Ligand binder design. Sequence first.
Ligand code: G2P
Ligand code: G2P
Ligand code: GTP
Ligand code: GTP
Ligand code: MG
Ligand code: MG
Ligand code: MG
Ligand code: MG
Lengths: 428, 428, 426, 426
Amino acid sequence: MRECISIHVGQAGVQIGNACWELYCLEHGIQPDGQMPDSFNTFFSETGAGKHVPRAVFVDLEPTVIDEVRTGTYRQLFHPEQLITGKEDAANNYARGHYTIGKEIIDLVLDRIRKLADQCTGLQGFLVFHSFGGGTGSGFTSLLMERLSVDYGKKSKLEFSIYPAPQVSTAVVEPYNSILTTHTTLEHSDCAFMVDNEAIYDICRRNLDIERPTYTNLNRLISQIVSSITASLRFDGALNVDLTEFQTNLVPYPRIHFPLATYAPVISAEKAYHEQLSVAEITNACFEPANQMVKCDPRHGKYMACCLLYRGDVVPKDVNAAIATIKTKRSIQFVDWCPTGFKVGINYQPPTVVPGGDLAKVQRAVCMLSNTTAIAEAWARLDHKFDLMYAKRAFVHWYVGEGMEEGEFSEAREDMAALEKDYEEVGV
Amino acid sequence: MRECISIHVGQAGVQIGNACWELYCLEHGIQPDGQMPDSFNTFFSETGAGKHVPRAVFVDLEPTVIDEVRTGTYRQLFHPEQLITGKEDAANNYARGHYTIGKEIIDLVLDRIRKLADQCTGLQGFLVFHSFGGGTGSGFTSLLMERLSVDYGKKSKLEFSIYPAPQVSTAVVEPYNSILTTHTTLEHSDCAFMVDNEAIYDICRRNLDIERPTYTNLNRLISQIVSSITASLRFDGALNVDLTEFQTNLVPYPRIHFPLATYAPVISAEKAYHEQLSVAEITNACFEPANQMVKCDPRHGKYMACCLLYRGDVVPKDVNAAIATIKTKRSIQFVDWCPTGFKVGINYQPPTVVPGGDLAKVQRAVCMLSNTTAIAEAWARLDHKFDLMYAKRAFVHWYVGEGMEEGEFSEAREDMAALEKDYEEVGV
Amino acid sequence: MREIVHIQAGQCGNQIGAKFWEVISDEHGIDPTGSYHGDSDLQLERINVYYNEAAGNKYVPRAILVDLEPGTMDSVRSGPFGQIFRPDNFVFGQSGAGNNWAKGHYTEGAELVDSVLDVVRKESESCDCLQGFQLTHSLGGGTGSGMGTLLISKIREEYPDRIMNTFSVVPSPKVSDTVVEPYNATLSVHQLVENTDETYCIDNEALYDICFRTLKLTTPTYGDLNHLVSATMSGVTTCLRFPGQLNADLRKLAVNMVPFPRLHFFMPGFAPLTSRGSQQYRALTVPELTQQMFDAKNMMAACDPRHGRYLTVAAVFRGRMSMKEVDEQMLNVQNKNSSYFVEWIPNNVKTAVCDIPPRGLKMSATFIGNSTAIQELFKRISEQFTAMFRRKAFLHWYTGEGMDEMEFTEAESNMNDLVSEYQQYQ
Amino acid sequence: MREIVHIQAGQCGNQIGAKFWEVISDEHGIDPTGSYHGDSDLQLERINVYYNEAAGNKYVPRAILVDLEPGTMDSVRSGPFGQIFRPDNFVFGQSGAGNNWAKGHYTEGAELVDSVLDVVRKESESCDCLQGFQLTHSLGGGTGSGMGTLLISKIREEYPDRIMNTFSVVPSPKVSDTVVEPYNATLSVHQLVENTDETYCIDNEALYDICFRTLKLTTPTYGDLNHLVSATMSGVTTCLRFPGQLNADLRKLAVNMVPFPRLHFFMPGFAPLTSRGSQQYRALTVPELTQQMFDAKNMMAACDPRHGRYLTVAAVFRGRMSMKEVDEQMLNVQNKNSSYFVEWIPNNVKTAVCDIPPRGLKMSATFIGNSTAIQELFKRISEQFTAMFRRKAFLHWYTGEGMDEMEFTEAESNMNDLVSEYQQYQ
Ligand SMILES: Nc1nc2c(ncn2[C@@H]2O[C@H](COP(=O)(O)CP(=O)(O)OP(=O)(O)O)[C@@H](O)[C@H]2O)c(=O)[nH]1
Ligand SMILES: Nc1nc2c(ncn2[C@@H]2O[C@H](COP(=O)(O)CP(=O)(O)OP(=O)(O)O)[C@@H](O)[C@H]2O)c(=O)[nH]1
Ligand SMILES: Nc1nc2c(ncn2[C@@H]2O[C@H](COP(=O)(O)OP(=O)(O)OP(=O)(O)O)[C@@H](O)[C@H]2O)c(=O)[nH]1
Ligand SMILES: Nc1nc2c(ncn2[C@@H]2O[C@H](COP(=O)(O)OP(=O)(O)OP(=O)(O)O)[C@@H](O)[C@H]2O)c(=O)[nH]1
Ligand SMILES: [Mg+2]
Ligand SMILES: [Mg+2]
Ligand SMILES: [Mg+2]
Ligand SMILES: [Mg+2]
C-alpha cells in the first residue's frame, strides 16, 4: 500500500541517499545484500525469496559517485538498472543540467520511474534529494520536476535540498544556479526542506564535540531527519502523520512551502549520561536558534506553523505540557492569523543509531518542521550575491554558450523578488 | 496424432534449426544420439528401441553448413537421408535458387518430405525456416512453397524468416531477393513471422548485458519463440492453442498474414534476482517497442490482433487483469473493426534453458504474436532500397543470366505496392 | 566438390604461385613431400578444392606451370616446395618472348598453348565439379601477358559458364621496369576486359610502400612482396576451404561486387600489418582491423581511394569474431565516410566470416574494393600508349610478329571507353 | 569515459611530458613495460583517462610526441619510460626551427603538421568520449611556439566543443635564454588568446626561486624543475582519475575560474614543499598547506600576487581531510587578506578534494589562481617587443619565412588590449 519513491540526484543527493539507505536497512533489519534473517514495504519491493530492493533511483551525470555504490558495500542492495549514469557532468552549469546534458538522459530516468511506480499500489509520492548549487542538482532536477509534475501531478512532491551558505560556499557560481532552480522549484515542488552545511558543522562541533566533521558526519545527521519524517509511515505509533496531512498542516499558501527543519537531541555519548533528556527539554531545545539547520534568526521572524514529530518513549500529556510552555514564551512569536500553530506526531520507535556514528542512543527524539518568515533573510543575501555578480555579467557567457538566454536570468531574479515580497506580506 | 514437420533451408535456416533441435532434445529428455533414458511424438518419430528421430528435413545448396551437422554433436540424431546437400550454392542469386540450381534438387526433397509425411497420422502442417536475402532462402524456398502448396494445399504452412534490416545489412543484393520472394510468399504461405537481426542484437546488448552477441546467441533466442508456439502441442496446459486456431485468430484477411513476434522476459542471470517478474510485468513489457523482434514503431501503427502465449506458473485471473490494464492504455491502439483483439494461451511448462545460454531460468514467460499496420514501414524502406538500385539496373544482368526476365522485377514491385496499399486500407 | 584450377604464366606469375602454394600447404598441414601431417580434421575436410589426392596418402596441387623459358621451371623445381608439383604439369617452351606480347600471344605462345590446353582439360576431367580458374601473371612482359591472355581466351571458350579469376601484377607509374610495358599492358588489359569475371589489380609500387611505411622493413625482397599477395589470395578462398558463420565463395563475391559486366577490376587489401616493434603497442580487435583495412595507404594498388568512390567493397574476416561487432564497424565506416561511397547502392559493404584464422594470428582480414579510382591506373597507361604510338615507337618488332596497327587502335579505344564508363558511374 | 589526449611539442615540452608520464605511471602502478603491478583496484578504475589498453594486459599513454628535430625523440626513447610510448605516435621532422616562430608555424611545421593531425584524429576515434587536449611546450623558441600554436589551431577547428589546455613555459625577465624570445612569445601568446580555454603560465625563474629558497636544493637540474611542473599537472586532473568527497574536472575548473573569455591565464602553485632537514620540524595539516599555497614566494609564475588581485582561485586537495577544516581555512584567508581578492565576486575560492593522496605524502595541494598580476608578464614582453620592433631588429629572418610586418603589429596590439582588460577588471 503506502509507498515512497526516493530520487537521488547529483553528488550530494547520492551521498545523502547512501546514508539514508544504510539507516533504513539497519532500521528494518535488511542486510547489505537485500536479505532479512510488514511496514518496510513502504521503502522496499520484495522479490522472490531472501531479497528486498529499495524503491529508489540514483542519478548522476558523471560515473564517479555512483561507481562507488556499484563497487561498494551495498552493491547487491540496488539492482543495476536503478543506478543511472551519464558520461559528462553538468560541470556546475545549470544549462548543461537542464538542457545540453540533461535532455539526453531524462527520458530514460522517467521510464525507470514509471516502471518503479507501476509496482506500487498505494503511491504516497516522491522524496527528491539534491543541491541547489550544482549543475546537475539544479538544472537536471528542475527538468525532472517538470516532467514528474506533468506525468503525475497530484501525487505529492518533497525535496530535501542542500542550500548554499552565506559565508562558507565551496563553489563560485552557486548564486546563479540557486536563483535558476528556485524559479522552477516554486512552480512545481509542493514542499521543500532547506538545509545548510555550515549550520550542520556548527552543530557537530558544539553539540557533538567533533573537532573535524567530514561530509559523512553531516549526511548521517541529515538521514535522521528523513527517518523522522518517514517513521510515521514505516512504523505504527500512538498518534500518526501522513505526507498529505503534513502538507495540509504546514503549508498555509501555495508559494510559502519552505519549512526549515531541526532535530533534537544531537549529543555525544558521554554528554548523554549526565543530561536527563526529557520530552520538555528536547522540545525546548528545538525552539533555540543555535540548533537550526539553516543559518538565520527566528527571533527576528514569526512562526506560521510548526510540526513536531516525536519518536520513542513519549507520552502525549508531557508533549502537551511542553507545547503549553512554548506558547507562554514571548521571544517565540507566531503570526496572529494562526492562533493554533502546532501539528504533533508521536511514534513508538526510538531513533536507531548507525554503528560508528557520532550520535548517542537515546530513548526520545524530535524533529521539528517550522514555516518561519525569517527564512526570507537567506533569500535576501542570496539575491544580493546574485546581483553583484550579474552587475558585471561575470561567468554569464558560459550559460549563454549552452543555450541559456540573458532574459531568463532577469526573469528568475524577478520571480525571487516577488517571492520575498510575498513572504513580507504574510508576516504583516 | 498431432505432428509438425520442420524444413530448414539455407545457412540461416540450418543454424536456427540446429538451435531449435538442441532445445527440443533438452525439453523432452532426448540425448544427442536419439536415445531417452507421449507428446514428444509431435516432433519425433520413434524407431525400434532406444531411438527417436526428428520430423525434419535440412536443405542447403552447398555442403558446408550441413557437413558441420554431419560431423558434429547431433550426427546420430538425424538420419543421413534427411540432410540434403547440393554441390553449388545459389550464390546470393534468387534465380539460381528458384531455377538453375533449385530445379535439380526439388524433386528429391519433395519425395523425402512425402515419405516423412506418410509416417505421420495427424499432420498439423509445416514449419519452414529460412531468410529472405539469400539465393537459397529466397529462390529455393519460393519454389518449394509452390510445390508444397500443390501437393498438400489445405495443410497449414508457417514460415519463420530472417528479414533484412534497414541499416545493418550484410549483403548488397538483399532488396532484390526480398522483393522476389515476397511475391510467391503472398501467394502461398498462410502466416509468416518476420524477425530482424538488428533488433535481436539490441535486445541482447540492452536486456541481456552482452557486449558482443554472435549468431549462436540470436539463434537460441529465436528457438525460444518457436518453442512457445509449439509448446501448446508438445505439452498439456490449462488453456491451449492449435496452429489452425492460431491462424483463425491472428489473420483477419488472407493477404494480411505477417504478425511480428516478441518474447518476455529476456534477462540476465543477475538482473533476474532483483526483479519480481510477475505476469503483469512481463505482459506490460511485451507491448513496449524496445523489445520487438522487428525494427518499427507500433505507436505509429494500429493492432489488428494479438495472441498472447503464456508458459509456466501462470493463472488465468492475473493474465485477464494484465489484459484489462493493457486495454486502458491510450498509447496502444487497436483498429475499431476489432473490439476484441486478444487470443490467449496458457501452458503449464516453464521455459527450459539451454546449458551455456544467455537467458536465465524463469518461472514465467510469454510470446506475443501481433498483427500491426506498422510493419508496412519495413516494406516501404525495402521498396525504396529496391527502387534506387533498379533505377540504375545495378546487378540485374546476373539475374537475367540465370533466366530471369526484367518484367518479373517490375511485376514483383507492383505486387508489393499493392500489398502496402492493402495494409494502408485496413488501418483506416 | 567445388574444385579450383590454378594456372601460373611467366616468371613473376610463377614466383607468386610458388609462394601461394607454400602458404596454402602450410595452412592445410601439407609438407614438402605432399603428406598430411596436420592436427585438425578441418584441414583435410575440403583439401580437394586445391589438391588432388595421389596414391599412398599424398596430395598434389591442381596447378599448371607455364613459361616460354625453361630456367624458371628449374628454379621452381629446386625451390622449397618445388617437389610437390606434378612433373607433367610443367609446360615450358625453349625460346622466351623477349618482352613482346605478340610473341607470347601469336607466335611462340601459340605453339606452346595446345599442350597447356591438353593438360588443363585433363585436370578439369579429374575434378568432379570445377568452380573455375585462377591465373597469376603480369601485364608488362610477353609471356604472362600475351601467352596468359591467349590461354584465358581458350579456357573461356571451353568453359564459358565457369568463374575466371586473375591476379594481375600491373605496371606502376614511377617504377617503370621496361620500355614497351605500356604496349603489353594495353594489349592484355583489353583481352582481360572481355574474358575475366574478376581481376585483382596488384601493384609493385603499392607493395613497396606497404613494406617500407607499414611493415618498416629494412630490405624488401620480391619474396616478401609476393608473401603479401599470397596472403590476399588465401583470403578470398578461405570460405571454400573452411567452415564459418557467414560463408561467401568466388561466385557470391563476384555477384555482390560487380554491378556492371565490365567493372570487374578490384583493388585488394590485407590486414593486419605491423612491424616487430609495433606488435606490442596494439589492440587485437575488429575495430582496429577495420580501421587498417579501409585506409588508403593499405591498398595494394597505387590508386588513391579518396580520388574516387567505392562502388562495392567485400570484407572477408578470419578468426572467432562477434557478428554484431563486425556489422557495427562496417556501418560506422560507411556513415562516417559517406562521401567515399556511391550513394545509389545502399549498403555498399558485403561481409563474410570464416572461423579458421591464418597461422600465427587470432584475427585477420581481406579487403576487395571496386573503386572508381582504378581509372587512374588505366588513364596513365593510355597516355603512355598514346605517347609511344603517335611516333610509332617500337612498333616494328610487334609487326614483325604478325601484329597489325589496327589492333593497337582498337585496344586503346576500348580502354578509353572503359575509363569513361568508370568516370560516369562515379 | 572522459579520455584526455596529451601532446608534447618541441624539446622543453617533450622533456616535461616525459616527467609527467613517469609520475603518472608510478601513480597508477604502471611499470616501464606498460604492465600494471599496482595493489589498489582504484589505480585501474579510471586508467582509460590517460592510457589505451593494448593486447596482453599492457597500457600505453594517449600521447603524441612532436619535434622538428629527431634527436629529442631518440633522447626520449632512450630515457627511463621511453619504451612505454607508441612508436607510431612519435612525429618528427629533420630540419629544426632555429628559434624561428615562422619556421615552426608556416614552413617546416606546416609540412610536418598533417601527420600529427592524422595521428591525433585516430587517437580521438579510439577514445569513446574525449574531454579534451593538454599541450606541453614553451613560447620562446620555434617548434613548441610556432608549430605548437599551428597544431592547436588545427585541433580547435576540428574539435571546437572540446576543452583545450596548455602548460606553457614562459620567458622570464632576468633569465633571458635567447635573443628573439620576445618575438616568439608575442606571436604565440596572441594565438593562445583565441584558441586555448585555459593556459597554465609556468616560469623558469620562479621554479628556480622555489628550488633555491624553499627546497634549499644545492644544484637544481632541469629534471628537478620539471618534476614540480609534473606534480602540478597531476594535481589538476586527480578528480578524473580517482574518487573523492567533492569532485571537479577540467571543465568545472574552467567554468569557476574564467569569468570573461580572454582571461584564462593561470598562475599555478603546489604545496607542500620542504627540504630534507625541515621535514621533521613541521605540521602535516590543512592549515599549514593552505598557508604555504597562498604565499607569493610559492607561485610558479614570476609575478607578485600582492601587485594585483585574485579574480578567482581554485584549490585542489588530495588526501583524507575534513571538509569543514578545509572550508574554514579558505574563508579565513579571504577575510584576512580581503585586499588581495576582487570584492565584486563573493567567495573567490573554489574547492575540490580527492581521497587518494600522491605517493609518499598523506596530504597535498594544488593551487590555480587567476590573478591580475599576470599583466606584468605580458607588459614586459610587450615592452621588449616594442624595443626590438621600433628598430626592425632580426625582422628579416622572419620575413624570409613568409611572415609580414603587419602580423607583428596585430599581435602587439592584441596583447596590449589584453593587458588593458586585466588592469581595468583589477
Ligand atoms: N610483385 C612481383 N613482381 C615481379 C616479380 N618478379 C618480376 N616482377 C615484375 O614483373 C615484371 C617482369 O615480368 P616477367 O619476368 O614475368 C615477364 P615474362 O617472363 O612474363 O615474359 P618475358 O618477356 O618472356 O620474360 C616487372 O614489372 C617485374 O618488376 C615478383 O616476384 N613479385
Ligand atoms: N622548465 C624547463 N625549461 C626548459 C627545459 N628545457 C628547455 N627549457 C627552456 O625553454 C627554452 C628553450 O626551448 P626549446 O628547446 O624547447 C625550443 P624548441 O626545440 O621548441 O624549438 P627550436 O627553436 O627549434 O629548438 C628556454 O627558455 C629553456 O631555458 C626544461 O627541461 N625545463
Ligand atoms: N550536505 C552535503 N553537501 C554536499 C555533499 N557533497 C557536496 N555537497 C554540496 O553540494 C554542492 C555542490 O554540488 P554537487 O552535488 O557536488 O554538484 P553536482 O550535483 O554533482 O553537479 P555537477 O558536479 O556540477 O554536475 C555544494 O553546496 C556542496 O557543499 C555532501 O556529501 N553532503
Ligand atoms: N538470425 C540469423 N541470421 C543469419 C544467420 N546466418 C545468416 N543469417 C542471415 O541470412 C542472410 C544471408 O543468407 P544465408 O542464409 O547466409 O544465404 P543462403 O540461404 O545460404 O543462400 P546462398 O548462400 O546465397 O546460397 C543475411 O540476412 C544474414 O544476416 C544466423 O545464424 N542467424
Ligand atoms: Mg558532480
Ligand atoms: Mg549459403
Ligand atoms: Mg620470363
Ligand atoms: Mg628543439
